[PDB]
Design a protein around this ligand. Sequence first.
Ligand SMILES: [K+]
Ligand SMILES: [Mg+2]
Ligand SMILES: [Mg+2]
Ligand SMILES: [Mg+2]
Ligand SMILES: [Mg+2]
Ligand SMILES: [Mg+2]
Ligand SMILES: [Mg+2]
Ligand SMILES: [Mg+2]
Ligand SMILES: [Mg+2]
Ligand SMILES: [Mg+2]
Ligand SMILES: [Mg+2]
Ligand SMILES: [Mg+2]
Ligand SMILES: [Mg+2]
Ligand SMILES: [Mg+2]
Ligand SMILES: [Mg+2]
Ligand SMILES: [Mg+2]
Ligand SMILES: [Mg+2]
Ligand SMILES: [Mg+2]
Ligand SMILES: [Mg+2]
Ligand SMILES: [Mg+2]
Ligand SMILES: [Mg+2]
Ligand SMILES: [Mg+2]
Ligand SMILES: [Mg+2]
Ligand SMILES: [Mg+2]
Ligand SMILES: [Mg+2]
Ligand SMILES: [Mg+2]
Ligand SMILES: [Mg+2]
Ligand SMILES: [Mg+2]
Ligand SMILES: [Mg+2]
Ligand SMILES: [Mg+2]
Lengths: 197, 127, 61, 172, 48, 106
Amino acid sequence: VEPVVVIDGKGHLVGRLASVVAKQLLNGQKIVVVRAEELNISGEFFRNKLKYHDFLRKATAFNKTRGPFHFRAPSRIFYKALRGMVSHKTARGKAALERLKVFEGIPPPYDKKKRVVVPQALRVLRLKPGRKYTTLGKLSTSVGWKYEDVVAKLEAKRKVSSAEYYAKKRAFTKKVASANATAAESDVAKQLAALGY
Amino acid sequence: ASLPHPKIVKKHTKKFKRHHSDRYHRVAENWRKQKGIDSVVRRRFRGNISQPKIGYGSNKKTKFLSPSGHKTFLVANVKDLETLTMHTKTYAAEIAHNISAKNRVVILARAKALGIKVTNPKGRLAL
Amino acid sequence: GIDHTSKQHKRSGHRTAPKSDNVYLKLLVKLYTFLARRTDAPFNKVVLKALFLSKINRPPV
Amino acid sequence: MAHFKEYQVIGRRLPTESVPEPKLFRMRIFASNEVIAKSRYWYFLQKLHKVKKASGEIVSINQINEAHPTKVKNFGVWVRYDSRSGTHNMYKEIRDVSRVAAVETLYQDMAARHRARFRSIHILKVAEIEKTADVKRQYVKQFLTKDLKFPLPHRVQKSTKTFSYKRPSTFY
Amino acid sequence: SHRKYEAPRHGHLGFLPRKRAASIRARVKAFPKDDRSKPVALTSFLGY
Amino acid sequence: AESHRLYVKGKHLSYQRSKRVNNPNVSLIKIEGVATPQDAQFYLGKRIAYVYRASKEVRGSKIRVMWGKVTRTHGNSGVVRATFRNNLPAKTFGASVRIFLYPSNI
RNA sequence: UUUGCUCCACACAAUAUAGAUGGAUACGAAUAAGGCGUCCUUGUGGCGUCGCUGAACCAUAGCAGGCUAGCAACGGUGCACUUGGCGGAAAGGCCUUGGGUGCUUGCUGGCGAAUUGCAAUGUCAUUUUGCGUGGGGAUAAAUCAUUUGUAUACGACUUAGA
RNA sequence: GCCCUGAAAAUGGAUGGCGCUCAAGCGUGUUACCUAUACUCUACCGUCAGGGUUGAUAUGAUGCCCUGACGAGUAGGCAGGCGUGGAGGUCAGUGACGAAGCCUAGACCGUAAGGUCGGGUCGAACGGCCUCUAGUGCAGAUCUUGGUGGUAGUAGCAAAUA
RNA sequence: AGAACUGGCGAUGCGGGAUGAACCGAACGUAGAGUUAAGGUGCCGGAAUACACGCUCAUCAGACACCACAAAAGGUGUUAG
RNA sequence: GAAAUUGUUGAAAGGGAAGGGCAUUUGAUCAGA
Ligand SMILES: [K+]
Ligand SMILES: [Mg+2]
Ligand SMILES: [Mg+2]
Ligand SMILES: [Mg+2]
Ligand SMILES: [Mg+2]
Ligand SMILES: [Mg+2]
Ligand SMILES: [Mg+2]
Ligand SMILES: [Mg+2]
Ligand SMILES: [Mg+2]
Ligand SMILES: [Mg+2]
Ligand SMILES: [Mg+2]
Ligand SMILES: [Mg+2]
Ligand SMILES: [Mg+2]
Ligand SMILES: [Mg+2]
Ligand SMILES: [Mg+2]
Ligand SMILES: [Mg+2]
Ligand SMILES: [Mg+2]
Ligand SMILES: [Mg+2]
Ligand SMILES: [Mg+2]
Ligand SMILES: [Mg+2]
Ligand SMILES: [Mg+2]
Ligand SMILES: [Mg+2]
Ligand SMILES: [Mg+2]
Ligand SMILES: [Mg+2]
Ligand SMILES: [Mg+2]
Ligand SMILES: [Mg+2]
Ligand SMILES: [Mg+2]
Ligand SMILES: [Mg+2]
Ligand SMILES: [Mg+2]
Ligand SMILES: [Mg+2]
C-alpha cells in the first residue's frame, strides 16, 4: 500500500523474511530492509557457522575469483537467500532485485521513516520457545564481517536520537489525547460515536 | 461491394518456414518435411516450429477469399475480364503481370464500365 | 484417447463407381443409381453393383 | 482413513437347507463410510470364522451415535498393530467426548508415534473408564485433578496482512 | 595418480597476482594501532 | 478532493501458467484489499485497464490503454484471472492495473 | 574556440517510464512480557488502563474543484521569505522564529456547470535532453610528438621540456 | 517410533536451488486450490461411414446437401496434389507501349508443395488450360566442377660474416 | 548373461518424476471454454507460510515410488508400549 | 548479371554465442471497406 515498505529485520527468520520479500519484489513492491545484522536463523550458532563454512569451501577450482562469492555481511547473506529465491538471471528478476535495498543498521534516509515487521517471518511468532537460533551479526563477524562494532556504535547513537524524538512525540500525543478527551461529550462527538467514530 | 461472408478466419497466418532455413543459406524457406530419424521437428518436441497439417485448413465458406471477399481471377485482356460480368460480387480481376501499360488502360476502363473490381489497378501507371 | 475396436477410417472395400472411363457406362450407372435409390428394387441395387465390376469380375456369359 | 463413524454390522454366513437361520454375527466397526464398514466387517469375520463375503451376507448395518456426545469421557483403548518387525498389543487412554473422536485420536497417535498406518491397526476394544482412579496413564490422569487450571503462554496470533506496524505481543 | 615424490610448491600464493603495482609509490595498507595517550606523531616517513 | 480514483488498484502478477509453460491469453491480477475468492467474486466481470505512456502521440494523446475484464477467481488468496482484448506485454508483470467498478451490480 | 562553458528562472520542443493516481504515518527492548496514563517512598515500585491487529490514524466536500457575500474564531493549511538549532552511516533531512500573502468545508447564503450527447486513461505524474529569452559566475588541461630509464615485448609505467 | 553412534576419497556442489526447526522435516487425517495435446460442450479442417437430391431455368450428379464417428507414428504401402525440360491441342493467350531472368523485413491466395500481384533491373521471347513424355525437384554422399570465406593483414619473408 | 506372460520404448510428442527412450498420468487435426489425471500449492513457480493430532534438534538432521544406496550392533537422547 | 563473400550508407539490437516457438508492448511499414 506504500510506495516503499521498510522492514526492520531484527528477529525476522532470514529464510521466511526472504520469501516474503522476494514475493513482494516480484509483485512490484519496493522493499528496504534495515538492521540486517539483527536477523535470525533457526538452529544453533555452531550449526549455522558450520553451514557457512561448507558454503565457504565451495569455489571454482581453477580460479577462485570465478567461483561463488561468499559475502560476509549480514545484508549480503540476506541478499544471497533472497537472490536464490528470485529468478535473478532474467530481466524480470533483475528488475525485482533492483526494487530492493538491504542495510545493516538504519541509515539516515530510513532512520526517520516508519519500519514494519512481517509476522509470518517473526522469530518470536514462528519458532517454538526454547529452540536455539543464531544472530546474523554474530555469524557474519565469525565469518569475516569487519563492521559489527561500527554498526553497533551508530545504532546506539541513532537510538539515543530516536528515543529523544519519541519522548517528544509521546508528550505531544498526550497533549492531543487530552484535548480529544475534552469535547468527547460534545454533540459532534456524540454523533460521531453514533456513527462509529 | 462483395457478397456477404462470415468473418474470415486464418487459422495460421505466419508462414511455415522450413527447419534450419534460418541457420543455413543453402536451405530455402520453401517448406520441407523433416524425414530425419532424430529430427526434433519431425518428433514435434515442445519449442520447435509447427508443421503444416490439414487441421489448419480454412473454412470452405471463406477459402480463397481476399480480404475484400472476392476471389482473384487472373485476366490478360478484355475478354478474360468480361468472363466476370455476372460475377462482380464474387470475383475480382487481377491484371496479369505481363500485360502492357496500354492494354492495362483498356482493361481498367472496361472493368470500370462493367463494375468489375480490379485488385491491382495501379500497375504500370503513368510515370 | 479412444481404445478403438476396429481400424479407423477404413474404406468399405467395395467399388462405388466403375473404374472405367466409358461415358456410356457412366450414363448407365447414373440411370441405375437413380433406380436403385428410388425403386426399392433388389434387382436394381444388384445391377448397379454389377455395373462397377472389373473385367475379371464380369466373366462372359 | 477419514473422520470416523461407528457402525454395527451384522452378517449371516448365508443359510442353506442344512442350516437355516445361521448365527447372526455382529461387530462394531469404526469406519469413515458404510462401504469401508462392511469391508472391515468381512475382513475381521474372515479372521474369526470360516466365512467370506461370497458365502455370507450383510444382515444389517446401522450407525451408532454417541449416547452422550457432550460429556467428557476417559476411554481405555486396546489395539493390536503390526510394527515393521512384529505384532504387538497396546493399551492407551484417550480423553474425548465420543468413541469416534477417541478412535480418530488413536489412529492419529498410532501413526504419529509408531508409524502404524490404518491397515496395520486392529481396534480390539474401546471402553469408557467409568471410575477415575482406574485411569492408569499419567498423560490422562493429570487432567483429572480438582480445579484444573492452566495458562496458554506465548499466544501467537496470525496476521491477515503481510506487514504489521506494531511489533506484536504474545501475552495471553 | 599421486605426485610420486613430495616437494613444496614453487612460490607464494599470497603474493598473487605477480602483476605490476598500480603505482611507483607503494601504498601503506595498515598504520600502527593508535595509542591516544602518546603525543601527536607521524606513523611513517617518505624517503628515497 | 485530493483523491479522484474510481478504480481499485491491482497488480499484474503473471500469465496463467504451469511450472514450465505460460499462457499469455490469461493474466493473473492481484486486486488490492481482496484476500479470498469470496471477496474476488464481487470483482468478477469488472473492466480492467492497463494504462501506459508512449512517446509517439496517437489520436491526440501519449497515453494508451489495454482493456480487459475479470473472468474468474484464481487460487485461495483473492487473485483473479483476467482476459484482455490484446494480451498484456509481460513486461508488466508487477505493473499497476485499474479494476473499475463497472459493470456495476450495486 | 568560426561567440565557447556553467548555474538560476521562464517558454517552446523532443525523450522515455519494471509502472504515482490521498499520506513510506520514525522509540527502544521484552515476548514465561509489554505500551500508555497517574502517584509516590523514583524502583526490577504502587495503582489504573489497553491489546485479542493498520478493519487504525491522519487526511478526505467545492468548474481535477470556479466566482462572490457574510458569521464565528485567532485556529488549521499552501506559498515565497525570514530566526536560531540539530543531523556525516548514504548527513541532503528534522525542528524552530517572526512577519507577509492565499485558501479554509468550523457555520450560513448568492451565481456557474449542461451538448464529453448512455462508457471509452479521456490526458492532471516525473526522467533525461535540446533550443530560445533574460540574469549570475569561471577564464584549463590531457593526449600525440620530443625526452627520461627507477619502466618496458607492444601498449603501459616513470620522468623532463615555454 | 524419530534422532544419534556405527558412517572413510579424491575439482567446489547439490532434498533441483534458495532456504526451512510447534517446518517449508517425519507419520496421519480433512478440505480448498493449481494445471496436460486427457475428459465434457461448441466451432472449423480433413478422413471414413451411412443417407437425401437428375422433376425442370439447374453450367461443378466425380456435383449440391443431411447425419454420425474418427484424426499419434519410424520402416513401409497407397491416394490426392505442387513444381521442371520437351511434345499434340486449345486460349485467333502475353510481349520491344517491354517476354524471360534476376532483386525486392511490399501486397494477396493455398494446411502445404507452391501460385499471384506491385516496384526496381532487363532486353526477345514466354505462359493458362486439356492431354503426352522424361536425363523432372537436393542439404548432406571425406559427393563432382567452379567460385568464396573465417583463420588473417595472421604464420611468416631469420642458413651462406656486411 | 538367458527364458515366460503382459505392458511399453523402438516408432511418441504431451503433463509429471529438476534432469533422463522405457516410470507415473495420458497418447496428439486447428481453436475456444470448463474439469481434471499424475504431480504439486514458502519463494524460485501456477496453486492454502491451509486446518488437525502427534514425533524429531542432528558439532555429517530430514525431506517422496522407479532413483540415483547403507548394515549388523549400540544410546537414562526422547516418545509410546 | 544470382548466391557465397565484401565495402559504404541507413535502421536496429548486443553483461560468456547466435538462430527458433507461443503471446503481446514498442518502432517502422502496409493491404483491405
Ligand atoms: K536460407
Ligand atoms: Mg578476506
Ligand atoms: Mg498463409
Ligand atoms: Mg529414434
Ligand atoms: Mg603424496
Ligand atoms: Mg544418519
Ligand atoms: Mg515445495
Ligand atoms: Mg504432513
Ligand atoms: Mg483442445
Ligand atoms: Mg458418401
Ligand atoms: Mg496420421
Ligand atoms: Mg531434357
Ligand atoms: Mg520484364
Ligand atoms: Mg532478401
Ligand atoms: Mg537482343
Ligand atoms: Mg536426374
Ligand atoms: Mg548444394
Ligand atoms: Mg538428406
Ligand atoms: Mg564437401
Ligand atoms: Mg571445392
Ligand atoms: Mg608477422
Ligand atoms: Mg624462419
Ligand atoms: Mg645471411
Ligand atoms: Mg531401429
Ligand atoms: Mg509413450
Ligand atoms: Mg529426480
Ligand atoms: Mg504463487
Ligand atoms: Mg537399528
Ligand atoms: Mg555484364
Ligand atoms: Mg550477397
